Structure 1
Amino acid sequence: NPCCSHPCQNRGVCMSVGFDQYKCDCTRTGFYGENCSTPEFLTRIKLFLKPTPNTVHYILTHFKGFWNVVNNIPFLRNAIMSYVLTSRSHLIDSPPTYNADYGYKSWEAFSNLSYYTRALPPVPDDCPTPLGVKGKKQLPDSNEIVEKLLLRRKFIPDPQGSNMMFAFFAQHFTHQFFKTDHKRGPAFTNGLGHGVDLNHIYGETLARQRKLRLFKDGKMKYQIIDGEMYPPTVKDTQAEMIYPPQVPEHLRFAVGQEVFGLVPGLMMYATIWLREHNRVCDVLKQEHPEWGDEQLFQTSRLILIGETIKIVIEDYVQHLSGYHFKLKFDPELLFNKQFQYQNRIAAEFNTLYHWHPLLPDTFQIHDQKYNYQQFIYNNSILLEHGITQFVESFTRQIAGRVAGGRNVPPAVQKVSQASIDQSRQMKYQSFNEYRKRFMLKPYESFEELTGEKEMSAELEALYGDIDAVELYPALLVEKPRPDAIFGETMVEVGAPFSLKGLMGNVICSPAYWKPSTFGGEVGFQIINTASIQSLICNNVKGCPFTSFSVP
């Protein structure tokens, strides 16, 4: 297969022509030639003027005084934010194209929502090497890579100051659209909403939703334990959950996502968001004493969706980016732009989001420490301390650095191995191919990748060729930005996926984005004034201080 070498540059589409030849489709690439590598004139001007992402990053993370001014000039701030959204979004094909089973456009690949979609097509089945033509005939042993490059010896804290509130928010939020269907395989998902539909609160199916709802005042079922609201049980709802046999029945909390009983940190956010829904129901009832249970429920969900997108953009990504420029959730920024209000979750987005180096060696709640053996699947811990103590504790506890290598806790070691193995089962192209796909220069050496001599040597001994290095391992050992949680590739590849999932949500479309959609101005304002602090403040006893970084 002549396309095995990935001849076509700059998004050119490769097509076999006979058995020994290929043809590159250069349509609207800005290039031409046999391999789409010759630039047209305006492309040359664009490339000459375009600053490197590391330069843009430097500028956005320095000159605080300058950004303080920009931030307070709405006209400028809006123009910048608008540019951030459209420029990054252009990197995503929407409607989607490839999946694990199709390296060419097909109706199956487009129409079948059970697949994760693909930013780069799978490597053809009949290639001389598993990645195309580069690297050895067999990839390095999964376990070797994990042990040599990814396994944590000494905990490395995040220099950006990310805390456990950030880590569990990341896990909680993303697990509404990262829902791998392992019955089928890693290529498939159970999140057919393909974005931020809050199914991890309300359930994927209507049947599950009905089990969780109270059908009074639009609210969700709950328990009152030690004076506070908690989610209901499997018994009361009949909504299935993943729990080991050890967990007693009355501790088997039931929420939207079946897996959120895994850790108390997830059950914390599930608890918090449950309280928010029922709180919003109270608000809306005051506004609409004439509304039935149905409209109260639905309208609350639309509000909580807006709250989610609001918080993610202006607190989560804000913290995550390190930018002094103040990000803004404002759908109106895009109303005069070309933009597709739809999304399909990319498998590569799932892969890059395996941020298990965030996880600590032990979890500190109040004044007690828990190892993984006793923290996992233990909801009594949650009842023992209550939500307030959890927020105060997690806000103070530092998370680990994601990039930089050797920071995956031994407890979730096999998870890292599974993330590598599943990439290969899904025929991912190389790390350098994904760099080029997102307009980054490919790395020329292993030492260039890590910015260091030790790991780069293990990399060379394992891979031999820099173009044979795989996506997921490379992301975690890549040289971090200066005092940053991530390296260049994580950000430039991840950001476009993220923004498409956030702004591509239906509520951001002009027909939806208006007061009447959310029950009037009061409801509309709950979205537009939402923050991670106000979320905690409204639903957590005592209204503790919280933030995505440690004080």
Structure 2
Amino acid sequence: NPCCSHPCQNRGVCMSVGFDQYKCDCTRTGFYGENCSTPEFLTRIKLFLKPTPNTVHYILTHFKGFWNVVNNIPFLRNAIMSYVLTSRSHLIDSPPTYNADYGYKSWEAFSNLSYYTRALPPVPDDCPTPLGVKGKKQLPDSNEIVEKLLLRRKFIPDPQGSNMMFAFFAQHFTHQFFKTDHKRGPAFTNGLGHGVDLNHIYGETLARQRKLRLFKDGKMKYQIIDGEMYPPTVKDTQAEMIYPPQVPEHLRFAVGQEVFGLVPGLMMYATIWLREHNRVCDVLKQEHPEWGDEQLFQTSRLILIGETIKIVIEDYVQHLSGYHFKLKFDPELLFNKQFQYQNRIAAEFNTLYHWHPLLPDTFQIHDQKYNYQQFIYNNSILLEHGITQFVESFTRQIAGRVAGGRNVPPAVQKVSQASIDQSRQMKYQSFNEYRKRFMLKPYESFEELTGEKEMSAELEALYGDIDAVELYPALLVEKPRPDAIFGETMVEVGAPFSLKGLMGNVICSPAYWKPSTFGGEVGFQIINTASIQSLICNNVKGCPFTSFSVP
């Protein structure tokens, strides 16, 4: 296949013409020529006036005195936030295009929701090398890559101070749209909503939802233990959950997501959100005594969705970005813009979000310290200590650094390898191709990627060519930004995926973004004043202080 070398630059579409020739479609790329590499006049100018991401990142992470002024001038904050949203939006194809089985546009790829979509097309089948034309005939041994480059020798804490509240929020939140269907294969998903629908609370299907609902006051089923509200059982709901035989019947908590019983950190947030839903039902009941159970349930769901997006932007992304600028969740910022209120989850977004290095060596709850074997599938620990003690402890324990290499816990060594192996059967293009796909300069050397000497040497011994380095491994060994959890690429690729999934949500559209949608101003206000602190304060006994970073 002549398109194996990925000849078309700047988002140009490559098409074969006969057996030995190809053609590049430069339509609306701002470039022309055989490979869409010659800039148009207007393009030369725009390229000359674009700051580098590292320049812009510097600006947003310094001058705290300046940003403190900007954050308190609504007009400016709105203007800045508007830029942040729109300056990235042009990097996501919407409606979506390719998937694992289609490197050309097709109705199958567009219409079949069981697939993850793809930011870059899959490497064609019969190519000289797995990645196209660069690199060796065979990719390096995946286990060898994990051990030499990814495995933790000594715990590397996150310099930004991200804690376990953050790490488990990241996992809980993203696992509502990262639901890989490993029956079919890594290219397929079970989250047909393809975004923030809160299916991990309410269930992916109506059948599961009816098993989880109380059908009184709009609320979700629950049980009281030691005066505290917890999720219901599988026995009570008949809602299937993933549990080992060793887990007794009365400890098989049923929640929206079948796998959230795997780890107590997930069951903590599931409990918190469950409580929040029933709390909002009580508020709405007070406001609307004429409302029935169905409308109480549906309106509460729409509110929690709003809370979720609110919290993710203004607390979660806020902490992750390290910006002194105060991010703002406000759908009105897009009402005068060209924006598509739809989204399809990208397989690469999933891959890049394998933040295994976040995980500590042991989990520390109160006085106790649990290893992975003791912590996994253990709702006893949740009942023993309680949510309050969980929050206090998770807020204090720091997470591991994601970029910079060699920080993956040996306990999840198999999962790290799987991420590499699964990236290969989905035929991912190289790291540098994804750099270019998101307006970044390709690395010219291994040393430029890692910013050090020995890991880069290992990469060269394994891959040989810098253009042969794979997406997932490179993201984890990439040179971090100064005192940051990530490197340049992780942010520049992830941010557009993330913002698209948040602002693209239907509740953000002008027809939905109204008080009547959420039951009136009281309901609308719950969204617009939501925070990770208030979420905990409203639903966790004692109202403990919490944050996404260690104090």
TM score, norm. by length of structure 2: 1.00
The whole-number CA distance in structure 2 between the counterparts of 1:31 and 1:252 is: 58
Q: Secondary structure at the match of 2:176?
A: coil
The whole-number CA distance in structure 1 between the counterparts of 2:58 and 2:25 is: 36
Cα displacement (A) at 1:339: 0.2
The whole-number CA distance in structure 1 between the counterparts of 2:70 and 2:18 is: 57
Cα displacement (A) at 1:239: 0.2
Deviation sequence 1:98-119 (CA, Å, 0-9, x none): 0000000000000000000000
Cα displacement (A) at 1:15: 0.2
Q: Which residue of 1 aligns with 2:410?
A: 410
Cα displacement (A) at 1:83: 1.1
Deviation sequence 1:323-378 (CA, Å, 0-9, x none): 00000000000000000000000000000000010000000001110000100001
Cα displacement (A) at 1:428: 0.1
The whole-number CA distance in structure 1 between the counterparts of 2:345 and 2:534 is: 29
The whole-number CA distance in structure 2 between the counterparts of 1:391 and 1:96 is: 39
The whole-number CA distance in structure 1 between the counterparts of 2:161 and 2:491 is: 17
The whole-number CA distance in structure 2 between the counterparts of 1:468 and 1:277 is: 48
Q: Secondary structure at the match of 1:24?
A: strand
Cα displacement (A) at 1:96: 0.2
Cα displacement (A) at 1:73: 1.1
Q: Secondary structure at the match of 1:146?
A: helix
Cα displacement (A) at 1:414: 0.4
Q: Secondary structure at the match of 1:364?
A: strand
Q: Secondary structure at the match of 1:537?
A: helix
Cα displacement (A) at 1:42: 1.1
Q: Which residue of 2 aligns with 1:520?
A: 520
Task: Find runs of 4+ consecutive structure 1 residues off by over 2 angstroms.
Answer: none
The whole-number CA distance in structure 2 between the counterparts of 1:281 and 1:127 is: 57
Cα displacement (A) at 1:508: 0.1
Q: Secondary structure at the match of 2:257?
A: coil
Deviation sequence 1:80-104 (CA, Å, 0-9, x none): 1111111111100000000000000
The whole-number CA distance in structure 2 between the counterparts of 1:30 and 1:76 is: 30
Q: Secondary structure at the match of 1:22?
A: strand
Q: Secondary structure at the match of 2:413?
A: helix
Cα displacement (A) at 1:313: 0.1
The whole-number CA distance in structure 2 between the counterparts of 1:42 and 1:228 is: 63
Q: Which residue of 2 aligns with 1:291?
A: 291
Q: Which residue of 2 aligns with 1:159?
A: 159
The whole-number CA distance in structure 1 between the counterparts of 2:502 and 2:342 is: 10
The whole-number CA distance in structure 1 between the counterparts of 2:318 and 2:45 is: 31
The whole-number CA distance in structure 2 between the counterparts of 1:503 and 1:241 is: 31
The whole-number CA distance in structure 2 between the counterparts of 1:509 and 1:86 is: 15
Q: Secondary structure at the match of 1:99?
A: coil
Cα displacement (A) at 1:395: 0.2
Q: Which residue of 2 aligns with 1:314?
A: 314
Q: Which residue of 1 aligns with 2:20?
A: 20
Cα displacement (A) at 1:57: 0.4
Q: Secondary structure at the match of 1:98?
A: coil
Cα displacement (A) at 1:148: 0.3
Cα displacement (A) at 1:532: 0.1
Cα displacement (A) at 1:517: 0.1
Q: Which residue of 2 aligns with 1:91?
A: 91
Deviation sequence 1:405-448 (CA, Å, 0-9, x none): 00000111100000000000000000000000000000000000
Deviation sequence 1:25-83 (CA, Å, 0-9, x none): 00000000000000001110111111100010011000000000111111111011111
TM score, norm. by length of structure 1: 1.00
Cα displacement (A) at 1:126: 0.6
Deviation sequence 1:178-226 (CA, Å, 0-9, x none): 0000010000000000000000000000000000000000000000000
- The root-mean-square deviation of aligned C-alpha atoms, in Å, is 0.3
Cα displacement (A) at 1:462: 0.2
The whole-number CA distance in structure 2 between the counterparts of 1:88 and 1:124 is: 28
The whole-number CA distance in structure 1 between the counterparts of 2:462 and 2:238 is: 49
Q: Secondary structure at the match of 2:364?
A: strand
Cα displacement (A) at 1:520: 0.2
The whole-number CA distance in structure 1 between the counterparts of 2:485 and 2:529 is: 28
Deviation sequence 1:481-517 (CA, Å, 0-9, x none): 0000000000000000000000000000000000000
The whole-number CA distance in structure 1 between the counterparts of 2:115 and 2:446 is: 33
The whole-number CA distance in structure 2 between the counterparts of 1:139 and 1:433 is: 16
The whole-number CA distance in structure 1 between the counterparts of 2:409 and 2:57 is: 29
Deviation sequence 1:294-318 (CA, Å, 0-9, x none): 0000000000000000000000000
The whole-number CA distance in structure 2 between the counterparts of 1:360 and 1:210 is: 37
Q: After superposition, where does 1:117-196 map in structure 2 within 5 Å?
A: 117-196=117-196
Q: Which residue of 1 aligns with 2:436?
A: 436
Q: After superposition, where does 1:392-403 map in structure 2 within 5 Å?
A: 392-403=392-403
Deviation sequence 1:147-188 (CA, Å, 0-9, x none): 000000100000000000000000000000000000100000
The whole-number CA distance in structure 1 between the counterparts of 2:190 and 2:448 is: 38
Cα displacement (A) at 1:452: 0.4
Q: Which residue of 1 aligns with 2:266?
A: 266
Cα displacement (A) at 1:250: 0.5
The whole-number CA distance in structure 2 between the counterparts of 1:398 and 1:188 is: 33
The whole-number CA distance in structure 2 between the counterparts of 1:175 and 1:474 is: 23
Cα displacement (A) at 1:530: 0.1
The whole-number CA distance in structure 2 between the counterparts of 1:418 and 1:241 is: 23
Deviation sequence 1:374-398 (CA, Å, 0-9, x none): 0000100000000000000000000
The whole-number CA distance in structure 2 between the counterparts of 1:314 and 1:252 is: 34
The whole-number CA distance in structure 2 between the counterparts of 1:542 and 1:532 is: 15
Is 1:11 equivalent to 2:11 in the alignment?
yes
The whole-number CA distance in structure 1 between the counterparts of 2:524 and 2:211 is: 28
Cα displacement (A) at 1:291: 0.3
The whole-number CA distance in structure 2 between the counterparts of 1:478 and 1:131 is: 20
Deviation sequence 1:270-304 (CA, Å, 0-9, x none): 00000000000000000000000000000000000
The whole-number CA distance in structure 1 between the counterparts of 2:81 and 2:22 is: 41
The whole-number CA distance in structure 1 between the counterparts of 2:244 and 2:443 is: 45
Q: Which residue of 2 aligns with 1:69?
A: 69
The whole-number CA distance in structure 2 between the counterparts of 1:107 and 1:388 is: 50
The whole-number CA distance in structure 2 between the counterparts of 1:427 and 1:46 is: 33
The whole-number CA distance in structure 1 between the counterparts of 2:49 and 2:342 is: 31
The whole-number CA distance in structure 2 between the counterparts of 1:480 and 1:165 is: 22
The whole-number CA distance in structure 1 between the counterparts of 2:58 and 2:534 is: 31
Aligned length: 551
Q: Which segment is superposed worse, 72-81 or 348-357?
A: 72-81
The whole-number CA distance in structure 1 between the counterparts of 2:512 and 2:32 is: 41
* Structure 2: tracts of 5 or more residues without a match: none
The whole-number CA distance in structure 2 between the counterparts of 1:63 and 1:119 is: 34
The whole-number CA distance in structure 2 between the counterparts of 1:88 and 1:255 is: 35
Is 1:350 equivalent to 2:339 in the alignment?
no
Cα displacement (A) at 1:523: 0.2
Deviation sequence 1:462-483 (CA, Å, 0-9, x none): 0000000000000000000000
